[PDB]
Design a binder for these strands. Structure first.
Lengths: 124, 195, 48, 49, 49
RNA sequence: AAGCGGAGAGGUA
DNA sequence: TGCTGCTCATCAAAGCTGACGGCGACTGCCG
DNA sequence: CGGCAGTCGCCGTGTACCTCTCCATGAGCAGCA
């Protein structure tokens, strides 16, 4: 059984759609923690379900020595599984660090399941 | 990725607009990734494919009517369920007759999606029969429908990579001769704009 | 103004060598285009 | 006409007469021109350098 | 007013029962504003002597 | 044998 | 476990408001 | 279809010289004591 297929199925079970958010470099972890805190405080958990930042352990070379340093897959981009509601939009947008929702034209678009899968398997 | 020189795009007049004959607003939309633009469409393959495509669309609409009739009969049974005690029992007539307006909404419900699909297919076919170079297609959904159903027979993109193709596929001689013809025998704002 | 261009270009190349989805890559290309337009003539459109 | 000039423009009268005198040979179709009065800010930016 | 946004956005990120006034007050914007006004301004001028 | 660019304010003919 | 030296990043935006004449694209707008 | 008048944006607005001041920060992440 292919692990990617199982992950795709378990994500298809999860409700909502995945969306991408642009942020500043060096802010991903703090943005994630603040997002979780603001979600739990505002009781908006009925809209925001998951917040994740894909990261890979890359062999950084310090003076010839290979050490696994965690580097973000998408610099300044985070992924959230949610439903597009006005309250959720405002809550996620007004969080410190969020600049905007990347999407075609003006209305933000939803990622395909394969694209989300390709950025979640353990590879680092 | 190719980019564009600011001097020849944000100028008064926009000297890149005069070359491709496009309004500066359209260039503003295309260049900064806010609208799609088709660059070329081969007309012969479109020409000798009309019958097959329209027949397939007719089959798709028959597929819609297939669900339509069953939905109609199911709605009829659902309304009969409420009608079972409407004018023969002691239930208050207020709700038992406002469920008739609810059933009006119900009968409109199936025809809603029916007309939605009818309009979808009609507009898709009309747009595929009206396509011409340098036409802006916002609201991706339309573009996805076009690139899935009629995936071939045309090419379109977004950004400076498409402006490059538009500039490449430009015939100076034909446009110059046409403009000289217009300024020769013409009258109105057309002559001024061509000059 | 050179530094921002040569940083955004490198970020776009790195993001385009990972097989990233279309939306992110075209957003990056738009940002690069804005950076170059600000290099050649600053403030001609938008905010300086 | 057959003078390869663009109507609605401004050209120096010396070149105008030279072009007309050249075109009235090996054929003929003189161009039609009228005098114009220009400011000192438009004539300064319409030089040949 | 610039410190107010910081103090208002700092209280929705930490845990209650540990918040103290000595923890939500950041002095730096105020001293920055004072130092930017008294020096490098258009109305605090070098004296004539 | 080794540097000297921006912004603001006041004055002189 | 807490002061303090070393490092790095351009997407920011709530504030701003006392110029005035010439010239052309143009754009919604009316008939 | 056919014009059309108000609007919005960009261009320009004297010469030479003297004196004084100031020029990014906030968070993060090691490196100790």
């Amino acid at each position: 059984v292919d692990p990617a297929a199982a992950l795709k199925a378990e994500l298809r079970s999860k409700p909502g759609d995945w969306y991408v958010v642009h942020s500043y470099a060096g802010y991903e972890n703090k943005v994630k923690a603040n997002l979780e805190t603001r979600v739990q405080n505002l009781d908006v958990g009925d809209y925001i379900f998951q917040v994740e930042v894909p990261t890979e352990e890359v062999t950084e070379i310090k003076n010839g020595q290979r050490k696994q340093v965690n580097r973000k897959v998408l610099p300044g981009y985070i992924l959230v599984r949610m439903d597009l509601t006005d309250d959720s939009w405002a809550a996620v947008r007004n969080t410190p660090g969020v600049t905007g929702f990347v999407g075609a034209t003006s209305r933000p678009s939803a990622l395909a399941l394969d694209d989300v899968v390709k950025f979640l398997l353990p590879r680092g | 990725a190719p980019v564009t020189h600011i001097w020849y795009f944000k100028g008064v007049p926009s000297r890149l607009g005069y070359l491709l004959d496009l309004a500066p607003k359209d260039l503003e939309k295309i260049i900064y990734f806010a609208a799609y633009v088709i660059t070329s469409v081969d007309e012969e393959m479109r020409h000798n494919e009309l019958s097959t495509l329209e027949a397939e669309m007719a089959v798709e609409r028959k597929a819609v009517e297939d669900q339509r009739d069953g939905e109609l009969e199911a709605r009829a049974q659902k309304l009969e369920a409420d009608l079972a005690e409407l004018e023969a029992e002691g239930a208050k007539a207020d709700a038992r007759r406002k469920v008739r307006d609810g059933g009006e909404r119900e009968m409109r419900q199936i025809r809603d999606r029916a007309q939605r699909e009818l309009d979808r297919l009609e507009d898709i076919w009309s747009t595929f029969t009206k396509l011409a170079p340098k036409q802006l297609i916002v609201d991706e959904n339309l573009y996805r429908e076009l690139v899935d159903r009629y995936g071939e027979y045309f090419t379109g993109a977004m950004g400076a990579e498409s402006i490059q193709k538009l500039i490449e596929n430009f015939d100076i001689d034909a446009e110059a001769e046409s403009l000289r013809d217009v300024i020769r025998n013409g009258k109105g704002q057309k002559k001024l704009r061509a000059l | 103004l050179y530094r921002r261009v040569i940083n955004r270009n490198n970020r776009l190349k790195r993001l385009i060598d990972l097989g990233a989805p279309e939306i992110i890559v075209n957003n990056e290309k738009r940002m690069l285009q804005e950076s170059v337009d600000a290099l050649f003539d600053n403030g001609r459109r938008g905010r300086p | 006409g057959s003078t390869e000039f663009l109507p609605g423009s401004l050209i120096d009268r010396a070149e105008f007469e030279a072009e007309n005198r050249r075109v009235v040979a090996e054929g003929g179709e003189p161009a039609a021109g009228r005098p114009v009065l220009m400011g000192i800010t438009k004539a300064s930016l319409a030089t040949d350098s | 007013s610039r410190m107010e946004r910081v103090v208002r956005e700092r209280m929705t990120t930490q845990d209650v029962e540990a918040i103290t006034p000595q923890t939500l007050i950041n002095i730096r914007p105020v001293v920055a504003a004072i130092k930017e006004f008294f020096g490098t301004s258009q109305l605090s001028q070098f004296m004539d002597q």
